[PDB]
Write a protein that binds this DNA or RNA. Structure first.
Ligand SMILES: [K+]
Ligand SMILES: [K+]
Ligand SMILES: [K+]
Ligand SMILES: [Mg+2]
Ligand SMILES: [Mg+2]
Ligand SMILES: [Mg+2]
Ligand SMILES: [Mg+2]
Ligand SMILES: [Mg+2]
Ligand SMILES: [Mg+2]
Ligand SMILES: [Mg+2]
Ligand SMILES: [Mg+2]
Ligand SMILES: [Mg+2]
Ligand SMILES: [Mg+2]
Ligand SMILES: [Mg+2]
Lengths: 46, 56, 107, 74, 179
RNA sequence: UAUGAACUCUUAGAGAAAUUACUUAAUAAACGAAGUGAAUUGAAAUAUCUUAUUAACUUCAGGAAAAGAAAUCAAACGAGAUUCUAUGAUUAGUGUGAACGAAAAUAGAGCAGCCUAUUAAAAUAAGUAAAAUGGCUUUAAAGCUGUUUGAAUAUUGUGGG
RNA sequence: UAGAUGUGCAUAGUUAAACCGAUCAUUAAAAUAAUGAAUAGUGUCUAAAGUUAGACCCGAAGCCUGGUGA
């Protein structure tokens, strides 16, 4: 079954992993933004 | 910004060989000659050939 | 008046034909007392026959004809539709040349 | 013997600009190994490659290539 | 590569990337760079190893490996016989170090030398030179031998005699530095 | 038909995008070409084959790109660039099989030729054509290609098919 | 005005195949010696079908490629 994996989770690790700068500055991150931007998402990251 | 790009695009003209520079100089002279024209006398002689081969 | 009608037939040809004749005029249409060698056209000075290949004097290399064999057949076909086939220079694609070679030598 | 063998290079034709001992006299044309010409002679300006253009300027033809003279003495 | 220093020329043999960094000793004015004209056919989008050597027209080729009995296809690679030789340059007068294939070594002998192989104007050769061969071509154009050879070949073609060269600019910076 | 204004981020540098700090800093996706290139699947198993020069990824490029005015096809008559659609054709042919699969030609959409290219390019093309070998493609030809070698000079019959 | 243009099917069969042909093939020469095969097609509509496409509908575990996450 699922586990409580978000216990003790901080919001500084959310910007370093799934933030916006982590995606525009990486080759594989531009795809995610372009993919999410083509679908029409508002929340491109974090 | 464009003057430094057209000068950067034609910057390899200083690396041309004597033969390349010679062929590029002839086009200017050949293009300046223009196209030959057909005088009324030559046109009249061409019509005779057309009429002779069409009407007789 | 007849001369005016003749000039209206030469100007009725397609520009493709008029362009070729302007730079490669045969001796027939030249002035009566003109000489073929003199007052040549700038195109004629480069090569007397644009359809035949020419060996460049300075460099011993043959230059392709100005008009390829495919284009030689399009002018002969277009020149034969307006009865101006007697003006084009010698060509293997000429209807009379193809026929003469067959009768002379055969298969 | 066979109808096909290993393809081999016979060398490069060069005209000696000097008079190297044990090979040939000056202005001698022959086929030498590419290694010696490329690494020893050409840098020292001891010979020159006999390109088709060179043959024309010198007036000679391809039927003037000689053989190496190992016995040559200065 | 680590290229020798031209005997009487301030300009160094260009780098593999195209930069021509001058020594600290040579005085250079504010924001002065030696730029080589762009390669007409641009770099080689594949096999970037060929953008830094004389590879002619050879690249890394992909094909199959076939079994003796069942003829099962497996992908493999064919690499060009790339070496690293020191080729003599009559114009420069030194041993230009570069990576050249064995097929281009026979072309250097066929045309009469590295200098003759770099000055070829045919389209098939300019494509074989590549970005690196285009930098060595530019370099030998600055030498006085080639400059005095092209000026003599223009008199035979009926061309006017041929402003300041790159060697003079660097020479004038050594004079202006003392004033 | 003109005209004032039009903030911040993506988008100077840094950073936890819409902040800092500066400054009259600024360009998504799909579509195109090349490179690389599978497997499910079918063959009632399965290796060749098929799926498939597919999907996907990488680079580069423009509003389109690519291709393009015959070293093309035809067959003893002749056609006359490229591209798109249909027929030719469940054909020729290939393959043990399963299956894969042309071209000439015809009709239509378009039509344009040229090197003095209407944007500025040949002094007519040599490590090239081609050969052996290892592969791709493929009908054994032609075409692409790593390695080792390596020509000829125009119908007055030279060179390719 | 005038002339031409545009897949296809049938109109002749026979044989591996062509020549041949109301005849053809085998008989190593041929020959009523023997044996087999000869006469309405074509287009359209309606419906039912064979074939290739997902192919009457729903359902795997798994395989490969590209990305995501410590
Ligand atoms: K778990
Ligand atoms: K590489
Ligand atoms: K082949
Ligand atoms: Mg934790
Ligand atoms: Mg050897
Ligand atoms: Mg900013
Ligand atoms: Mg920024
Ligand atoms: Mg089976
Ligand atoms: Mg078949
Ligand atoms: Mg040629
Ligand atoms: Mg080949
Ligand atoms: Mg052949
Ligand atoms: Mg061939
Ligand atoms: Mg029949």
């Amino acid at each position: 079954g699922p586990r409580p994996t978000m216990s003790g989770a901080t919001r500084l690790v959310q910007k370093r992993r799934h933030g916006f700068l982590s995606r525009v500055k990486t080759k594989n991150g531009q795809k995610t933004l372009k993919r999410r931007l083509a679908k029409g998402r508002l929340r491109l990251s974090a | 910004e464009e003057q430094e790009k057209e000068a950067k695009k034609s910057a390899a003209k200083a690396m041309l060989t004597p033969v390349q520079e010679y062929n590029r100089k002839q086009r200017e002279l050949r293009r300046a000659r223009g196209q030959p024209a057909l005088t009324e006398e030559m046109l009249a002689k061409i019509g005779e050939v057309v009429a002779r081969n069409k009407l007789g | 008046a007849t001369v005016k009608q003749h000039v209206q037939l030469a100007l009725s040809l397609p520009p493709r034909l008029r362009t070729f004749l302007a730079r490669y005029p045969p001796a027939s249409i030249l002035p009566a007392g003109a000489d073929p060698e003199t007052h040549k056209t700038p195109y004629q000075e480069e090569s007397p026959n644009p359809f035949m290949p020419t060996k460049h004097p300075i460099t011993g290399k043959w230059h392709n004809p100005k008009y390829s064999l495919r284009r030689q057949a399009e002018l002969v076909k277009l020149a034969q539709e307006h009865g101006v086939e007697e003006l084009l220079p010698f060509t293997r694609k000429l209807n009379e040349e193809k026929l003469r070679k067959r009768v002379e030598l055969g298969l | 013997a066979s109808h096909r063998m290993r393809l081999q290079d016979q060398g490069v034709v060069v005209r000696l600009l000097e008079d190297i001992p044990k090979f040939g006299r000056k202005h001698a044309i022959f086929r030498i190994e590419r290694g010696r010409m490329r690494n020893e002679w050409f840098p020292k300006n001891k010979a020159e490659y006999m390109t088709p253009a060179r043959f024309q300027e010198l007036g000679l033809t391809r039927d003037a290539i000689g053989e190496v003279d190992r016995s040559f003495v200065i | 590569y680590h290229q020798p220093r031209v005997p009487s020329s301030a300009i160094p043999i260009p780098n593999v990337s195209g930069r021509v960094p001058l020594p600290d000793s040579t005085p250079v004015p504010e924001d002065f760079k030696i730029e080589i004209p762009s390669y007409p056919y641009g770099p080689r989008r594949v096999y970037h190893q060929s953008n830094t050597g004389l590879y002619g027209s050879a690249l890394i080729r992909f094909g199959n490996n076939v079994s003796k009995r069942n003829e099962i296809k497996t992908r493999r690679k064919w690499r060009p016989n790339v070496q690293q030789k020191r080729l003599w340059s009559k114009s420069l007068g030194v041993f230009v170090r570069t990576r050249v294939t064995t097929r281009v070594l026979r072309t250097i002998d066929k045309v009469g030398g590295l200098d003759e192989y770099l000055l070829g104007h045919k389209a098939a050769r300019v494509k074989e030179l590549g970005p690196w061969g285009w930098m060595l071509r530019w370099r030998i154009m600055q030498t006085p031998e080639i400059r005095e050879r092209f000026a003599k070949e223009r008199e035979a073609l009926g061309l006017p005699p041929r402003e300041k060269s790159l060697e003079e600019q660097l020479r004038e910076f050594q004079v202006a530095g003392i004033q």
